[PDB]
Amino acid sequence: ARYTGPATRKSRRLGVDLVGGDQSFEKRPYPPGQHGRARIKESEYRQQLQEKQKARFSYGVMEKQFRRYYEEANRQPGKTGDNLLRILESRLDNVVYRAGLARTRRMARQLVSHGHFLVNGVKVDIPSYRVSQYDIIDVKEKSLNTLPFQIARETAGERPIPSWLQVVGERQRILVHQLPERAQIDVPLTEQLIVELYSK
Amino acid sequence: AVKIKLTRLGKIRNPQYRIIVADARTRRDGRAIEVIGRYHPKEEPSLIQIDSERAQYWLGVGAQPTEPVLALLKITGDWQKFKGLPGAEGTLKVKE
RNA sequence: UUUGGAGAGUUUGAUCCUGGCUCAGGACGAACGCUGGCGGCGUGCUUAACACAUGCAAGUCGAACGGAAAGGCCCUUUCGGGGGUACUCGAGUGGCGAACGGGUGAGUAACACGUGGGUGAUCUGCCCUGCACUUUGGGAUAAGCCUGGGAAACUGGGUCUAAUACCGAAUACACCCUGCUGGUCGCAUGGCCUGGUAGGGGAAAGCUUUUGCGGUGUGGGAUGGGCCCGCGGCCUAUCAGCUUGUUGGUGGGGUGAUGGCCUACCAAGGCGACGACGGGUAGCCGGCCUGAGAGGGUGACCGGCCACACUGGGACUGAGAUACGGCCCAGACUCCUACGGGAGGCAGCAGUGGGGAAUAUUGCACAAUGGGCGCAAGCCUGAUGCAGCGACGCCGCGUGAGGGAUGACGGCCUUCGGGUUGUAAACCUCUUUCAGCACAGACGAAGCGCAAGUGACGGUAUGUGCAGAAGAAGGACCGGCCAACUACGUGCCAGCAGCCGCGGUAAUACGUAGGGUCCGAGCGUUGUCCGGAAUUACUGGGCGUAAAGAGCUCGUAGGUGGUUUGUCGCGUUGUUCGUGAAAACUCACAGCUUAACUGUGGGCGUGCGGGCGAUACGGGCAGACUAGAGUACUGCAG
Ligand SMILES: [Mg+2]
Ligand SMILES: [Mg+2]
Ligand SMILES: [Mg+2]
Ligand SMILES: [Mg+2]
Ligand SMILES: [Mg+2]
Ligand SMILES: [Mg+2]
Ligand SMILES: [Mg+2]
Ligand SMILES: [Mg+2]
Ligand SMILES: [Mg+2]
Ligand SMILES: [Mg+2]
Ligand SMILES: [Mg+2]
Ligand SMILES: [Mg+2]
Ligand SMILES: [Mg+2]
Ligand SMILES: [Mg+2]
Ligand SMILES: [Mg+2]
Ligand SMILES: [Mg+2]
Ligand SMILES: [Mg+2]
Ligand SMILES: [Mg+2]
Ligand SMILES: [Mg+2]
Ligand SMILES: [Mg+2]
Ligand SMILES: [Mg+2]
Ligand SMILES: [Mg+2]
Ligand SMILES: [Mg+2]
Ligand SMILES: [Mg+2]
Ligand SMILES: [Mg+2]
Ligand SMILES: [Mg+2]
Ligand SMILES: [Mg+2]
Ligand SMILES: [Mg+2]
Ligand SMILES: [Mg+2]
Ligand SMILES: [Mg+2]
Ligand SMILES: [Mg+2]
Ligand SMILES: [Mg+2]
Ligand SMILES: [Mg+2]
Ligand SMILES: [Mg+2]
Ligand SMILES: [Mg+2]
Ligand SMILES: [Mg+2]
Ligand SMILES: [Mg+2]
Ligand SMILES: [Mg+2]
Ligand SMILES: [Mg+2]
Ligand SMILES: [Mg+2]
Ligand SMILES: [Mg+2]
Ligand SMILES: [Mg+2]
Ligand SMILES: [Mg+2]
Ligand SMILES: [Mg+2]
Ligand SMILES: [Mg+2]
Ligand SMILES: [Mg+2]
Ligand SMILES: [Mg+2]
Ligand SMILES: [Mg+2]
Ligand SMILES: [Mg+2]
Ligand SMILES: [Mg+2]
Ligand SMILES: [Mg+2]
Ligand SMILES: [Mg+2]
Ligand SMILES: [Mg+2]
Ligand SMILES: [Mg+2]
Ligand SMILES: [Mg+2]
Ligand SMILES: [Mg+2]
Ligand SMILES: [Mg+2]
Ligand SMILES: [Mg+2]
Ligand SMILES: [Mg+2]
Ligand SMILES: [Mg+2]
Ligand SMILES: [Mg+2]
Ligand SMILES: [Mg+2]
Ligand SMILES: [Mg+2]
Ligand SMILES: [Mg+2]
Ligand SMILES: [Mg+2]
Ligand SMILES: [Mg+2]
Ligand SMILES: [Mg+2]
Ligand SMILES: [Mg+2]
Ligand SMILES: [Mg+2]
Ligand SMILES: [Mg+2]
Ligand SMILES: [Mg+2]
Ligand SMILES: [Mg+2]
Ligand SMILES: [Mg+2]
Ligand SMILES: [Mg+2]
Ligand SMILES: [Mg+2]
Ligand SMILES: [Mg+2]
Ligand SMILES: [Mg+2]
Ligand SMILES: [Mg+2]
Ligand SMILES: [Mg+2]
Ligand SMILES: [Mg+2]
Ligand SMILES: [Mg+2]
Ligand SMILES: [Mg+2]
Ligand SMILES: [Mg+2]
Ligand SMILES: [Mg+2]
Ligand SMILES: [Mg+2]
Ligand SMILES: [Mg+2]
Ligand SMILES: [Mg+2]
Numbered sequence: 025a026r027y028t029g030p031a032t033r034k035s036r037r038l039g040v041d042l043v044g045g046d047q048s049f050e051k052r053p054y055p056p057g058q059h060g061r062a063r064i065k066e067s068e069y070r071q072q073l074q075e076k077q078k079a080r081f082s083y084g085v086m087e088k089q090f091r092r093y094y095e096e097a098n099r100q101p102g103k104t105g106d107n108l109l110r111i112l113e114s115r116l117d118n119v120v121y122r123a124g125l126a127r128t129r130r131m132a133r134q135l136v137s138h139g140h141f142l143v144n145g146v147k148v149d150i151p152s153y154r155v156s157q158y159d160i161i162d163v164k165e166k167s168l169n170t171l172p173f174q175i176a177r178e179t180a181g182e183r184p185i186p187s188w189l190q191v192v193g194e195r196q197r198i199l200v201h202q203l204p205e206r207a208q209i210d211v212p213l214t215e216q217l218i219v220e221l222y223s224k
Numbered sequence: 225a226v227k228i229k230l231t232r233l234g235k236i237r238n239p240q241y242r243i244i245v246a247d248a249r250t251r252r253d254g255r256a257i258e259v260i261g262r263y264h265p266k267e268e269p270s271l272i273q274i275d276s277e278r279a280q281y282w283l284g285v286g287a288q289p290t291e292p293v294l295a296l297l298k299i300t301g302d303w304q305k306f307k308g309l310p311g312a313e314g315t316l317k318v319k320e
Numbered sequence: 321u322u323u324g325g326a327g328a329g330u331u332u333g334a335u336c337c338u339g340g341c342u343c344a345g346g347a348c349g350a351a352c353g354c355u356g357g358c359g360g361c362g363u364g365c366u367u368a369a370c371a372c373a374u375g376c377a378a379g380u381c382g383a384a385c386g387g388a389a390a391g392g393c394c395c396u397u398u399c400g401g402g403g404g405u406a407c408u409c410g411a412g413u414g415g416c417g418a419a420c421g422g423g424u425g426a427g428u429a430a431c432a433c434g435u436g437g438g439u440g441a442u443c444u445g446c447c448c449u450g451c452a453c454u455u456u457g458g459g460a461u462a463a464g465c466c467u468g469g470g471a472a473a474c475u476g477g478g479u480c481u482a483a484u485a486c487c488g489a490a491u492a493c494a495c496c497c498u499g500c501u502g503g504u505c506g507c508a509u510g511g512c513c514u515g516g517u518a519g520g521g522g523a524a525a526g527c528u529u530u531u532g533c534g535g536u537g538u539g540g541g542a543u544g545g546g547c548c549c550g551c552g553g554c555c556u557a558u559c560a561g562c563u564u565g566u567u568g569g570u571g572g573g574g575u576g577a578u579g580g581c582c583u584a585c586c587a588a589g590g591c592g593a594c595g596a597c598g599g600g601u602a603g604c605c606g607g608c609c610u611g612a613g614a615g616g617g618u619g620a621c622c623g624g625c626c627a628c629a630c631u632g633g634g635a636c637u638g639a640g641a642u643a644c645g646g647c648c649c650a651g652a653c654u655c656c657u658a659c660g661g662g663a664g665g666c667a668g669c670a671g672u673g674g675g676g677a678a679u680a681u682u683g684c685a686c687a688a689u690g691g692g693c694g695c696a697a698g699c700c701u702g703a704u705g706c707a708g709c710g711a712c713g714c715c716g717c718g719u720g721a722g723g724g725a726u727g728a729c730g731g732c733c734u735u736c737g738g739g740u741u742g743u744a745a746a747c748c749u750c751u752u753u754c755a756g757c758a759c760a761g762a763c764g765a766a767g768c769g770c771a772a773g774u775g776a777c778g779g780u781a782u783g784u785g786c787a788g789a790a791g792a793a794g795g796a797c798c799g800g801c802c803a804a805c806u807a808c809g810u811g812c813c814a815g816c817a818g819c820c821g822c823g824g825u826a827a828u829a830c831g832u833a834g835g836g837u838c839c840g841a842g843c844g845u846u847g848u849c850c851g852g853a854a855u856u857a858c859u860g861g862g863c864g865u866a867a868a869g870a871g872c873u874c875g876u877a878g879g880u881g882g883u884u885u886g887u888c889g890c891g892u893u894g895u896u897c898g899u900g901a902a903a904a905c906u907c908a909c910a911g912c913u914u915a916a917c918u919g920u921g922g923g924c925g926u927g928c929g930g931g932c933g934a935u936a937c938g939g940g941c942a943g944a945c946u947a948g949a950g951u952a953c954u955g956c957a958g
Contacts (some may be wrong), residue, residue, distance in 0.1 A: 025793085025840060028719070030744055030908050037836075038803090051726080057836045058733070058740065059828095069328095069344085073803050077838090081386085087839070101323075116914090127722070134720065138753045143913075147783095149753070150716070150914045157696085165944075172722070172750060224326065224346070225447045226543050230689050232704075233622070235362060238918060239705060241689055242902085247543055248446090249420060249640095252690050252703055252733050256902055257371075257543075265688060265764050265913070267919050286541055292689060301867075311409045314764070317913065319919080 026084070031130070034081040038074065040212075042082045043128055073218035077160070084113060084129050094222045099216075105215035106206055113209075116141070116153035120161070123189050124180035139144065140167035161198035168195070170175045228282070228289040230263050231256060238266045243293065244273060245282050262294070269319060274300050 028132065031050050035041045038057040054060045064070075080090050088113075097108035117132040121142070126132035132151075135141070140151025142162035155161075167173050177196050188204050191197060227248040230241035243261030247256065258281070261274040279302050281303050285288075289297065304311045 025718075025843090026720090027840095028793085030742075032743065033836095046729095055836080056740080056742090057805075058807090059835085062805075064803095066802095067803080070803055073838095094714095097322095101907090114377095134753090135751080137471075137717070138720095138751065139913095140751080145912050148913055152716075153914050167751095170751065175722085188770080220326085222345095225445090226688090227447090229691095231623095231902085233689080234918075235621090237553090237706080238917085239360065239689075243904085244544090248691080249544085252421065257626075259902065260334090262920085263689070264919065265500060266917090268763055269911090269919085270688095270764065271919055275408090275609095288447050290690070291769070299766050301528095313766095 025086075026130075026133070027081075032198060034077075036080070038078060042078075072217050072221040075213055078213055079112075079218055082129075083115070083118060084133060085112070085115070085152075093224070094219070103221050106203075108215055108219065109206065109209060109211060110203055114202075115151070116143075116148075116155055116161075116187050117151050119189065119198065120154055121199070122183070122186060123161075123191060123196075124182055124185065125163070125176055125196050125198070127176060131172075134166075135173075140164065140170065140173065155200055156199060156200065159200050163196045166218050226257075226282075226287050228287055228293045229254075239266070240264055245287050265320070269317060272296055272316070272318065273283060274302055276300075276302055276305070280306060 028036055031043065035043070035046050035049045037057075037060075038056065039053065039128055041049045049224065080087065086183065093111045097104050097111050100107045112123075117126075117129055117136055120126050120136065121129050121132040123157070136151045136153070137149060139147065140163070141148055142214065143153065144160050145162065146185050163173070177194070180197070185191065187208055188201050191198065191200055225248050226245055229244050229248075229250075229252070233240035233253070235243065236271055237284050241263035242256070242259060243263060244256045244259050246257050252279050258278065260278045261272070263272065264270070274297055279297060283302075283306055294303060300316065301313050307308050
């Protein structure tokens with residue numbers, strides 16, 4: 025089940041853009057509703073939940089899903105925040121988005137669910153697929169002939185490709201090498217709030 | 225007369241079987257002396273594993289396998305090694 | 321040498337402390353209320369261990385015997401049937417299974433459970449394997465035939481038949497017993513070296529002509545058992561004495577094995593304040609939840625044992641019995657009757673009635689695997705594999721989009737300027753997952769057969785095509801705790817509510833609208849358990865006033881000791897081999913497209929057993945001194 029309602033609601037109510045190209049957010053930054061300008065008392069729990077909901081409604085993950093990422097990240101011996109960031113970025117939807125093959129997380133997820141992608145020559149239609157180190161991502165001819173994929177792959181002038189991701193040619197082959205560090209990932213928001221909120 | 229049993233574990237839509245040497249009259253999932261191999265045919269290749277040394281020791285001391293166990297350990301090659309007629313042949317197909 | 325701890329509201333005019341309550345988190349074998357689409361993977365009577373309509377859940381051998389009731393063939397035929405055939409076989413003898421597999425937690429505080437060894441004190445069919453023999457005689461019965469009682473179950477009387485059914489006798493000299501004579505070991509009788517010695521005793525059955533199985537005994541192994549023990553694990557003195565085969569010895573019987581296991585004779589004690597005997601509760605454990613840990617709660621599923629089979633007892637059989645669908649008897653219930661008498665035990669798989677909040681289908685198969693029979697073929701198996709129902713739970717997926725206005729209806733407020741629902745929507749294009757309609761179509765089976773084939777699942781899972789955004793979202797909250805506010809309607813009424821607490825005409829707390837928040841195929845309520853609760857404080861609390869020093873001494877049992885002068889190492893660490901069943905937890909690997917699921921090998925498996933190596937503290941024991949204490953001499957005040 026995926027949130028079918030408007031996507032601009034999250035940014036408008038919550039106070040930071042998510043897609044990044046929202047003209048409505050910059051037109052009106054205050055939350056919608058008859059009384060979005062009312063003063064609100066500061067609360068550590070408000071801001072802790074705020075970071076959580078920013079993260080979950082930004083990456084489009086399920087609540088149980090994200091809690092499972094939390095406990096997983098906790099139980100790896102590595103640092104909890106970095107482990108959570110990797111275990112969330114390893115979603116094939118976010119990987120193929122940040123590789124430039126999709127215009128947004130929602131569209132990456134929809135295309136993966138419909139199954140336009142091949143993983144190491146094996147059919148994969150699961151938006152929440154797990155990508156480990158040294159994996160190969162392939163795109164089939166039925167999807168190269170697909171018009172929106174062509175638009176994405178010859179309009180891919182979005183945010184630069186990261187260190188661990190890289191494309192090799194026109195076939196849009198996505199390869200992963202190592203575990204990124206938080207500093208070069210430079211993802212917005214702060215995992216400390218989320219980890220502390222679930223530490224509650 | 226101790227026989228080579230296959231002990232059922234797990235849940236319903238996937239049967240479980242454990243190649244265990246134990247007394248015959250006990251329960252299907254009864255007391256287990258030693259665990260030597262495990263059997264589960266639901267998977268596509270249905271990979272089979274037996275500890276050859278312990279299997280040979282049990283056959284020598286006098287454990288009597290059931291016909292399916294005999295056939296499976298013949299696929300493994302334990303029966304071939306034990307009887308010595310053809311030798312020790314390995315043909316088991318490994319996972320892709 | 322590495323991994324992991326949150327608080328907030330609420331007493332007062334005000335705060336500080338203590339102290340109590342409540343809330344935010346996870347989990348359930350859950351339920352009700354609204355809503356609701358599919359597919360995969362689990363789970364399913366926790367109360368009434370209540371009675372149960374019907375059908376299933378335990379059968380196999382002609383290559384054991386006599387035979388041919390029903391099928392086949394061959395001679396016959398009048399189509400009533402008459403002969404052989406062993407292919408086949410009803411019923412009858414004779415074996416094997418039947419103590420296997422499945423179920424429930426009433427009683428049980430116990431060697432009942434886990435761990436640790438044990439047996440010089442046991443036995444063990446079917447399995448495999450080194451090693452003697454399998455001679456002989458006799459009689460009868462079922463079955464069948466005739467007949468009686470009687471609706472029935474069932475039985476008697478007479479005639480008669482064979483066997484691997486039954487019983488003698490011939491060997492045994494390697495065993496099982498009693499009396500006389502050595503070596504080793506200690507852990508004690510005594511065991512072992514089958515010690516030696518004289519006397520006595522001890523068993524078989526054959527079949528098949530083919531991958532051959534049987535009969536009697538125990539030097540060797542393994543499984544299976546039975547028994548004894550150190551240790552452990554609920555509450556309660558508003559439970560202080562308990563016991564008379566009770567305690568101990570000797571002699572007898574007893575049992576596979578020692579034993580007051582049972583009897584007789586002797587003596588009077590054993591257990592008891594380091595909680596006996598009494599009372600209530602309850603199956604135990606690996607595990608599950610919570611907690612950083614300690615700890616607390618608990619025994620879902622699975623698995624290791626325990627105990628039971630309508631209630632209470634008893635015994636036969638067997639290598640093996642609480643003997644669930646074995647036996648006998650007494651009770652209650654139900655049923656049949658021709659009234660003379662008989663049959664029962666779903667806590668087996670399904671199902672019904674009742675209780676409840678409630679928990680499924682009177683489904684398909686031996687395809688795979690375990691179990692029983694048989695030389696095999698083969699047979700049986702509600703064990704098991706599978707399917708059907710149910711958002712009850714861990715897990716994945718679907719109800720779309722890209723762009724689109726200083727933002728079209730309509731609703732709600734307005735300060736009447738306007739703002740709201742809103743990139744939402746109508747729109748132009750896209751792929752259309754999964755359902756829908758078709759084709760192909762598995763593996764699960766180096767399996768079994770000397771046959772020609774064998775898959776319930778399933779013609780599903782899975783691939784290949786067709787049409788269409790076409791078939792797909794709701795539930796709680798929005799006074800503070802606690803992310804979410806305004807208007808409309810009644811005002812100490814109607815009502816909310818987990819703590820404070822909210823309405824006495826203009827409520828962000830009641831009801832309705834919008835608007836926003838949380839969650840989502842689930843959403844809340846309710847109940848149980850942990851945490852915060854350091855709120856039972858060992859880690860980790862106090863006793864002046866909040867709860868607490870008993871009124872104070874003497875002092876028994878217990879707990880604890882002022883120096884240094886000496887062994888054994890029983891408090892203890894000093895290292896190593898030696899257990900820690902499986903499963904679960906944690907680490908890494910690998911497979912089902914990833915998802916639950918499971919496929920392999922590690923690792924984990926935090927306790928306890930014996931052999932070898934240490935002596936600083938923490939005790940008894942084997943000897944001396946005095947800084948605590950007491951005495952001794954002189955005075956002292958009260
Ligand atoms: Mg927490
Ligand atoms: Mg059993
Ligand atoms: Mg195979
Ligand atoms: Mg067979
Ligand atoms: Mg850790
Ligand atoms: Mg108050
Ligand atoms: Mg007060
Ligand atoms: Mg006050
Ligand atoms: Mg389903
Ligand atoms: Mg099911
Ligand atoms: Mg019946
Ligand atoms: Mg038979
Ligand atoms: Mg017959
Ligand atoms: Mg038997
Ligand atoms: Mg029986
Ligand atoms: Mg039985
Ligand atoms: Mg059960
Ligand atoms: Mg039950
Ligand atoms: Mg019980
Ligand atoms: Mg007791
Ligand atoms: Mg036997
Ligand atoms: Mg003879
Ligand atoms: Mg007769
Ligand atoms: Mg004769
Ligand atoms: Mg004789
Ligand atoms: Mg003789
Ligand atoms: Mg003699
Ligand atoms: Mg001799
Ligand atoms: Mg005989
Ligand atoms: Mg025989
Ligand atoms: Mg013991
Ligand atoms: Mg113990
Ligand atoms: Mg005696
Ligand atoms: Mg004696
Ligand atoms: Mg006795
Ligand atoms: Mg006596
Ligand atoms: Mg434990
Ligand atoms: Mg803790
Ligand atoms: Mg604790
Ligand atoms: Mg327990
Ligand atoms: Mg079990
Ligand atoms: Mg035991
Ligand atoms: Mg009984
Ligand atoms: Mg009884
Ligand atoms: Mg009984
Ligand atoms: Mg029964
Ligand atoms: Mg029965
Ligand atoms: Mg009964
Ligand atoms: Mg049943
Ligand atoms: Mg009822
Ligand atoms: Mg149910
Ligand atoms: Mg079978
Ligand atoms: Mg054959
Ligand atoms: Mg049958
Ligand atoms: Mg049958
Ligand atoms: Mg099933
Ligand atoms: Mg329901
Ligand atoms: Mg329903
Ligand atoms: Mg899902
Ligand atoms: Mg669009
Ligand atoms: Mg399809
Ligand atoms: Mg096949
Ligand atoms: Mg084949
Ligand atoms: Mg597929
Ligand atoms: Mg609020
Ligand atoms: Mg709030
Ligand atoms: Mg009002
Ligand atoms: Mg709303
Ligand atoms: Mg609690
Ligand atoms: Mg202390
Ligand atoms: Mg305390
Ligand atoms: Mg006081
Ligand atoms: Mg006092
Ligand atoms: Mg007093
Ligand atoms: Mg003393
Ligand atoms: Mg020592
Ligand atoms: Mg040692
Ligand atoms: Mg050890
Ligand atoms: Mg193991
Ligand atoms: Mg853990
Ligand atoms: Mg793989
Ligand atoms: Mg493991
Ligand atoms: Mg522990
Ligand atoms: Mg002392
Ligand atoms: Mg002196
Ligand atoms: Mg002195
Ligand atoms: Mg004086």
